[PDB]
Write a protein that binds this ligand. Structure first.
Ligand code: 3VZ
Length: 427
């Protein structure tokens, strides 16, 4: 238990997930008379530690807020951001501080930039999977390499039928077209194959007997888990056509990713993990398009100027022991700064709808509406514009590229031109 210091310290705390760090740790600090805040990315986790310690801490999530007068608060990073960040606490624990979702990143950076001014003595950056870590072996999971033999084609290797006859098995595949293709062949060999991915109702998975569930990362109880060892990963490309493209890329998975997928077996009883590849990237590198996400979340959810968002991301990049990324702070701040007078109605629909880049989407929707032009495609991304579809004609004033573009485009909008400058100035 890192002692509370005389001057402000940032501390790192690497210890297994579940053991001590969101639970025993804060309680020991409180037992010494300190005020302590414990930050977590997930709502369920924050309530999970709340309930478990209530046998009483303050609990601060978007959906539920309990104030109890306790010296211990469990918040998510998002609610922490919503509450204006640093008010009130001697000690702030950033739990699961490896997390590369926007919110967590803005959260920690916020804690890093502000904790000292606001009078804290200690910030503990806690996680069980700090940068460079690999997958540790699990007592309940036997791990067996797949070999070229077997009669089912699987990412260069093969799977034997014997391993997926009898019981429950989960096969992780990388995309959607690949889940369909694989489920289908198993149905054509008797086996009970069920594909799952974003845009399916969770009902379609049987609950009791034999199945081979072919899903992405979109109770389960599996006897076996089968992993293609790859992940579709969001990335940015500065393609100058006219500006940037948000697209995907399939990289070999990292440690936490291998963990997450292996952990779908061994749920108490024994488990089996069979792999396409023996290796893994180490964790601790994230794409530029995560920076774009921070500026997006900041502008859409957290009422931050681009500039404030930068101040918080700077603190995060000025701390050692954290996921590292390209320094595109001035670029990304530049971009969002030009993005003014969004339609609040469009913004509100792309937020509700769980869109990625809800701000950039609603902004391209805004620009489209005011021009009376259509969006770059009639995909699901552009749902907010359906009400107006009947009124919209001509070429799409294209700002950036978030997906497929079916409509002809104009490249001359002031916002398009402005962004273009940003990339020639800051890149
Ligand atoms: C998963 C991804 C698509 C996503 C979803 C949602 C958000 C925003 N967000 C995520 C969390 C975490 C939690 O639920 O505790 C959260 C909490 C409180 C607020 C909030 C509350 C008020 N009263 C005003 C404002 N402005 C914000 C927004 C939040 C960010 C990212």
């Amino acid at each position: 238990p890192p002692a509370v210091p005389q001057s402000f310290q940032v501390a790192h705390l690497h210890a297994p997930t579940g053991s001590g760090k969101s639970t025993k740790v804060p309680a020991a600090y409180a037992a010494q008379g300190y005020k302590v805040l414990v930050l977590n990315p997930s709502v369920a986790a924050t309530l999970g530690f709340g309930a478990y310690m209530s046998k009483d801490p303050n609990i601060r999530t978007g959906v539920r807020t309990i104030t109890t007068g306790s010296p211990i608060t469990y918040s998510t990073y998002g609610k922490f951001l919503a509450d204006g960040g640093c008010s009130a606490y001697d000690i702030i624990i950033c739990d699961e501080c490896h997390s590369t979702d926007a919110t967590s990143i803005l959260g920690i950076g916020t804690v890093l930039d502000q904790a000292e001014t606001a009078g804290a003595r200690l910030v503990v950056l806690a996680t069980a999977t700090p940068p460079g870590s690999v997958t540790v072996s699990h007592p309940n999971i036997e791990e067996v390499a797949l070999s070229t033999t077997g009669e089912i084609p699987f990412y260069g290797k093969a799977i034997p039928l014997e391993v997926i006859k009898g019981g429950r098995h989960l096969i992780f595949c990388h995309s959607k077209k690949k889940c369909d293709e694989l489920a289908a062949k198993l149905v054509a060999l008797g086996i009970n194959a069920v594909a799952y991915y974003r845009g399916l109702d969770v009902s379609v998975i049987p609950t009791s007997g034999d199945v081979v569930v072919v899903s992405t990362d979109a109770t389960g109880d599996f006897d076996s888990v089968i992993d293609c060892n790859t992940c579709v990963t969001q990335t940015v490309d500065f393609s100058l056509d006219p500006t940037f493209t948000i697209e995907t890329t399939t990289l070999p998975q990292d440690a936490v990713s291998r963990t997450q997928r292996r952990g779908r077996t061994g749920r108490g009883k024994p488990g089996i993990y069979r792999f396409v590849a023996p290796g893994e990237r180490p964790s601790g590198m994230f794409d530029s398009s995560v920076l774009c996400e921070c500026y997006d979340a900041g502008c859409a959810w957290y009422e931050l100027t681009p500039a404030e968002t930068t101040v918080r991301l700077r603190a995060y990049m000025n701390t050692p022991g954290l996921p590292v990324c390209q320094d595109h702070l001035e670029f990304w701040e530049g971009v969002f700064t030009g993005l003014t007078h969004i339609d609040a109605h469009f913004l509100s629909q792309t937020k509700q709808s769980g869109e990625n880049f809800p701000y950039l989407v609603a902004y391209q929707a805004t620009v489209c509406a005011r021009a009376q032009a259509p969006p770059p495609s009639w995909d699901q991304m552009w749902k907010c514009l359906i009400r107006l579809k009947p009124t919209l004609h001509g070429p799409t004033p294209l700002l950036y590229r978030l997906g497929a573009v079916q409509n002809e485009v104009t490249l001359t909008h002031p916002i398009t031109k402005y962004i273009m400058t940003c990339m020639s100035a800051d890149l």
